[PDB]
Amino acid sequence: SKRYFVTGTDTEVGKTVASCALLQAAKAAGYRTAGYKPVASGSEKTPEGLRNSDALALQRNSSLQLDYATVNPYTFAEPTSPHIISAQEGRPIESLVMSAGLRALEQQADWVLVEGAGGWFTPLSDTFTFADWVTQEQLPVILVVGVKLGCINHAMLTAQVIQHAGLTLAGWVANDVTPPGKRHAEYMTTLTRMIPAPLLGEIPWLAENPENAATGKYINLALL
Amino acid sequence: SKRYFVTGTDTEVGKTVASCALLQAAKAAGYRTAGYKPVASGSEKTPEGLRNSDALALQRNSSLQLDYATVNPYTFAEPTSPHIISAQEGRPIESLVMSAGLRALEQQADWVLVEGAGGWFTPLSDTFTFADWVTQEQLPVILVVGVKLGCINHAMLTAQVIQHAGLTLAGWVANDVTPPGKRHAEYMTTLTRMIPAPLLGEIPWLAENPENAATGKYINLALL
Ligand SMILES: Nc1ncnc2c1ncn2[C@@H]1O[C@H](COP(=O)(O)OP(=O)(O)CP(=O)(O)O)[C@@H](O)[C@H]1O
Ligand SMILES: Nc1ncnc2c1ncn2[C@@H]1O[C@H](COP(=O)(O)OP(=O)(O)CP(=O)(O)O)[C@@H](O)[C@H]1O
Ligand SMILES: C[C@H](N)[C@H](N)CCCCCC(=O)O
Ligand SMILES: C[C@H](N)[C@H](N)CCCCCC(=O)O
Numbered sequence A, B: 001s002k003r004y005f006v007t008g009t010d011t012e013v014g015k016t017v018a019s020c021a022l023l024q025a026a027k028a029a030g031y032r033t034a035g036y037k038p039v040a041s042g043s044e045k046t047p048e049g050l051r052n053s054d055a056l057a058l059q060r061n062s063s064l065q066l067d068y069a070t071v072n073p074y075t076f077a078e079p080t081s082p083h084i085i086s087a088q089e090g091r092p093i094e095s096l097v098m099s100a101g102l103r104a105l106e107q108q109a110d111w112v113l114v115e116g117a118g119g120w121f122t123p124l125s126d127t128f129t130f131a132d133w134v135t136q137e138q139l140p141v142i143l144v145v146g147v148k149l150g151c152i153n154h155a156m157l158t159a160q161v162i163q164h165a166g167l168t169l170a171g172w173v174a175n176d177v178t179p180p181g182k183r184h185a186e187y188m189t190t191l192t193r194m195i196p197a198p199l200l201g202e203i204p205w206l207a208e209n210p211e212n213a214a215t216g217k218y219i220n221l222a223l224l
């Protein structure tokens, strides 16, 4: 299966919006797709247990019908760092459970997108970070950049750390988190020049519900 | 002279507030202090030319009476990346002018604090970043961390890049940019454990005008 990990320059830059776009483009290319969100914090109560909105978006944008727990094995109610709430609850986040889940998806899908939690270095326990599991799995990484002041520094910091870990930075996606501002074009030229990976496409600012929008058209899967 | 460069986990995390605290603690220890902001964007018009608020704060918290241009040689009106507005204006930001300015302060001060612009990787031209000048000057770096969700990842990214450049990370300052929230203590324990440099102190959330507040007491200069 092709496999990709999606990370962002910060929490709340549109990582689930860009993952849905990527999943829609892959389905359009003919792949049997599956989204995977191994760890999620910030969840609603339902009759079936906790459900996280990001994981629900990944589940409904996959071309296979998948069960919720297959998409998101670890679900925590409080929107904080996974390692704080895990210790609070007495539910260790296990690397073998995260990896087994990825293998299970690979039995049925041939294009799998894995979304992390927060940014690159999100702690999963006191001695283990998300970055450690991605390095362990040798996943190529797609960086989502919310275009806003401060994003050049965050995109370059994340790009260098990934490359120093010996991982492939597969490409980056520009996500317009605000309406058209004055230095949009110059910001896009600097980011193109400085991130050592192809620009896969730019998702425009979409006021109402962008994760349900049809955004696959903004992604050129040909560069991945 | 002792010399330190102050950087932040992002733009707007309280870097000028923590620089004023640091300058007030150094003056209290008996040092002849000078703040230096070589490059500033986001400036007001006055009868004397453009003046930047950060640079004004550094100038009024120094124990020597210094002229504005000595504190801030490059002043741009638009609050954007220095390299965009520099090219726009036809005013190159020169590394020799930035370094000469630091030497000039060193003729009169024995404790000099240098504040950068934005975060670590802020571009100054199309082939030169702020990080390149700090490496060139071999300045030890103090990291200011605004305590908010997403800050563990940004503090670790910045800490690793500085150390990979062979620079000393002298310490870090925790700045409380919001009122007391639910996971404050756990966030402070994780950041202490993960940043390989002493915690110099924590500045509390101060609603009204914190750069004019007397905040020197929150800094332990003894660890620098
Ligand atoms: N293209 C766009 N236009 C308008 N709003 C957007 C947008 N992209 C993202 N947003 C909005 O910004 C917020 C964050 O989006 P998203 O959930 O995709 O980011 P993220 O995955 O980085 C969050 P987390 O760190 O919890 O995973 C949402 O409210 C979303 O609808
Ligand atoms: N301890 C604190 N309590 C309340 N507000 C604070 C604060 N620290 C910073 N702020 C506020 O946050 C904003 C940013 O502060 P500051 O100017 O020191 O940050 P900064 O230097 O990172 C900005 P720039 O990137 O332009 O240099 C200001 O409005 C400031 O008063
Ligand atoms: C204007 C702002 N307040 C600071 N002076 C400069 C921030 C530059 C950020 C560059 C970037 O990383 O995107
Ligand atoms: C709750 C939030 N929306 C994401 N699920 C997780 C963000 C973890 C951030 C950890 C940190 O770097 O401070």
Ligand SMILES: [Mn+2]
Residues within 6 Å of the ligand: A015, A016, A054, A115
């Ligand atoms: Mn998300």
Ligand SMILES: [Mn+2]
Residues within 6 Å of the ligand: B015, B016, B054, B115
């Ligand atoms: Mn400042």
